[PDB]
Design a protein around this ligand. Structure first.
Ligand SMILES: O=C(O)C[C@@H](c1ccc(Cl)cc1)c1cc[nH]c(=O)c1
Length: 289
């Protein structure tokens, strides 16, 4: 069976936790800590391995943006460092295409990146690709039909409803239809033929609204809202359902986990994380041993 892995996050300071939730039985396991605390990171999986990408260590003894890529092997319960990115990227988004990891946007101090780079596991090497048309931190990233999408974020001045698509064989970005809502630090994922954007921050409020982009019609449509307003949430897909983990609602660092059933267009509470946190990295792979 497969588990939902949550890595890092923020509560009072950046966190090192790696914990795994099993939808099939409701259990949480605490696994090997990250070597360096980090919030604002992203998670992804390639070849059954879990990767933690970017972020920032907000700590008593200083604040350090991360260029790190680290690899967790469920078979061994060990973290291993990989090649670092060209630049530190806090509040990063990532997507996987054809076994390669794309790192998108994020911040380094007051620098808000439009740059994008691609990691090749078989070479342990990062290479820059074409930059996005827009600087985006707190950017949502998803992959559909071997195309990469960057959705919302913050450009250093404004939070964004805009979104864009990267065509690998052209090494080019093009704008798509903007969302109906400004969202920085939404959760963005794919399910069936649609890109979903859940929650986020519009500069005033954390959001409970959820909308989805149909690549065939090029239009965004709202679906049922989440039960909890949240920005800086983690999101993933497990067996055809969207799960959202944690985040911030302007009052509380949430422990709430919700899942979305697209067939009934309903959100339900599923479990609580062991402690409230925002800015986690989340992905799905095999249980450890
Ligand atoms: O829009 C912003 O400036 C960044 C945004 C954010 C924070 C964490 C992450 Cl991981 C992703 C996005 C944010 C800021 C303040 N309050 C928010 O609720 C949300």
């Amino acid at each position: 069976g497969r588990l939902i892995y949550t890595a890092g996050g923020y509560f009072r300071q950046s966190l090192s936790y790696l914990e795994a939730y099993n939808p099939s039985n409701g259990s949480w396991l605490r696994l090997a800590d990250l070597q360096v605390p980090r919030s604002g990171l992203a998670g992804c999986v390639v070849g059954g391995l879990l990767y933690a990408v970017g972020g920032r260590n907000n700590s008593p003894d200083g604040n350090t943006d991360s260029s790190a890529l680290d690899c967790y092997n469920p078979m061994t319960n060990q973290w291993s460092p990989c090649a670092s990115m060209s630049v530190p990227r806090n509040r990063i988004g990532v997507g996987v295409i054809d076994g390669h990891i794309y790192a998108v946007g994020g911040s380094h101090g007051c620098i808000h990146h439009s740059s994008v780079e691609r990691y090749e596991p078989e070479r342990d090497e990062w290479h820059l690709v074409a930059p996005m048309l827009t600087r985006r931190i707190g950017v949502g990233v998803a992959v559909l039909n071997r195309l990469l999408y960057a959705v919302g974020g913050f450009d250093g001045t404004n939070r964004l409803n805009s979104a864009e698509c990267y065509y690998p064989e052209r090494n080019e970005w093009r704008m798509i239809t903007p969302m109906n809502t400004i969202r920085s630090g939404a959760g963005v994922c794919v399910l069936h033929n649609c890109i979903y954007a859940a929650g986020g921050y519009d500069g005033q409020d954390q959001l409970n609204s959820v909308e989805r982009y149909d690549v065939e019609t090029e239009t965004w449509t709202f679906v049922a809202p989440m039960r909890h307003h949240r920005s800086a949430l983690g999101i993933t897909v497990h067996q055809g359902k969207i799960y959202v983990l944690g985040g911030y609602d302007g009052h509380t660092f949430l422990d709430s986990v919700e899942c979305y059933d697209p067939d009934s267009d309903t959100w339900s509470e599923v479990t609580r994380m062991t402690s409230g946190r925002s800015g986690v990295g989340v992905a799905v792979t095999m249980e450890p041993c």
